[PDB]
Every structure is written in C-alpha cells, then in structure tokens.
Design a binder for this molecule. Structure first.
Ligand SMILES: [Ca+2]
Length: 223
C-alpha cells in the first residue's frame, strides 16, 4: 500500500496473509473455512495466516492454518486477469473471535464514488521498494467505468473496477494482491493489478466481487 497508514493491530480482522515460506499475497476470510483471494496469487503449498499484524513477529493472536484446497475461477485468464479470483479452503476451521472475523459478501455491486478500505503488507513505495511488517490501510474511492477504461484502454472488463486517485500518490501495490477492498462493510473488490503503483493516471484495478457471489456460494456448498 503506497500512501496509506498503519491500520492498527487486528482492526481489519478479515485480512489474511498467504504464506509459502514468506508472505506473498493477501486474502479475505469469508467464513470460518474459506478465504477469497486473487487467482494470480495461486501457489501450491499455501499456509493461511489469520490474526496477523506484524507478519515477522509472532504477537499472540495469530492462527496459522494450512490450505487443503485452492479453486481458481473456471474462467480465469492470467493474460488479461479477467476473473482474477480464487477460493482457498482451510484444513480446519478458524476460531472466530474479535481479531479473526469474516467479511460479508455483497448483495449489490458498489457504486462509483464510494470510499473503500484497501489493506495489505505490499510495497509502500511508488518508485523503489519497501515492505512493511505491519498491516497498512488506504481509503480509496471507486472510479467511474468510463474513467477506468480511459486509464487502461482495451484492458478493462465488466469483472474489473478501478479505485484510487488519478493524481497518483495513493494505491495498492505488489504484495497487496489478493487482499480486500471493503466498501459499506462488504467485500467488493480484490487487489488485482495496475500499471506500477500510485502513478499518475494509472489507478488500481480490482476484481469485481459482486459478479462472483453465485459462484462462491455454489462452490463452498459443494467443497
Ligand atoms: Ca504476527
């Protein structure tokens, strides 16, 4: 997250870190057994880390639970990142509590102009590299479809939306991928892609979770 703020420990209790020996992506806990993340975060051998604030210190509220199954969307296209969504099943259910909690799936799609909370342990620099240990947060508005398409001509599908600031300075970034975009208390987006981070005219692009709720509900009813 570039141009964000330190969230505060466990203030984003649905945020997970995906670990394969190291943090590599975020995700969102949607019930005690299942995480939503980006399909481009697929790796074999994932451990889900819940209750994290500093990902490099065991502070006492974590739950570390191996994935048993990962399910990339059936129409995921890794070239365009259309349908950039994955489900991860945990080997055992998380213990839900004040620090480890699920986020609701949406009923309606969020509106242009709505301010959403984006979070993660990704890079904090637009130019260069610095990865934080503690979770970072950013409030960013959803941009109009027209503005999104103008920013990325020929690249935005109806399963994507842009959020952020066209002047630059504030965005998600590498290492935030797969994490949550929460608007009106529901999971509306997944950190997916963007040209660089926090560059002028190149806002973040996010998977439009409201298009996937029926797939998510039938898949978790079946696995
Ligand atoms: Ca920790």
């Amino acid at each position: 997250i570039v141009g964000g703020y330190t969230c505060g420990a466990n203030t984003v209790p649905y945020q997970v870190s995906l670990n394969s020996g190291y943090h590599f992506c975020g995700g969102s806990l949607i019930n005690s057994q299942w995480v939503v993340s980006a399909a481009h975060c697929y790796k074999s051998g994932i451990q889900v880390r819940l209750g994290e604030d500093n990902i490099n210190v065991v502070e006492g509220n974590e739950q570390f639970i191996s994935a048993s199954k990962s399910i990339v969307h059936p129409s995921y296209n890794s070239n365009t990142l259309n349908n950039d969504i994955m489900l991860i099943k945990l080997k055992s259910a998380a213990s839900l509590n004040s620090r480890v909690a699920s986020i609701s799936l949406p009923t309606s799609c969020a509106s242009a102009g709505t301010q959403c909370l984006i979070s993660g342990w990704g890079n904090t620099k637009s130019s260069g590299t610095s990865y934080p240990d503690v979770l970072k947060c950013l409030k960013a508005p959803i941009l109009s479809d027209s503005s999104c398409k103008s920013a990325y001509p020929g690249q935005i599908t109806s399963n994507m939306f842009c959020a952020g600031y066209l002047e630059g300075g504030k965005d998600s970034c590498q290492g935030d991928s797969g994490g949550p975009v929460v608007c009106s208390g529901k999971l509306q987006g997944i950190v997916s892609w963007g040209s660089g981070c926090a560059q002028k005219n190149k806002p973040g692009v996010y998977t439009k979770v409201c298009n996937y709720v029926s797939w998510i509900k039938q898949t978790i009813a079946s696995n």
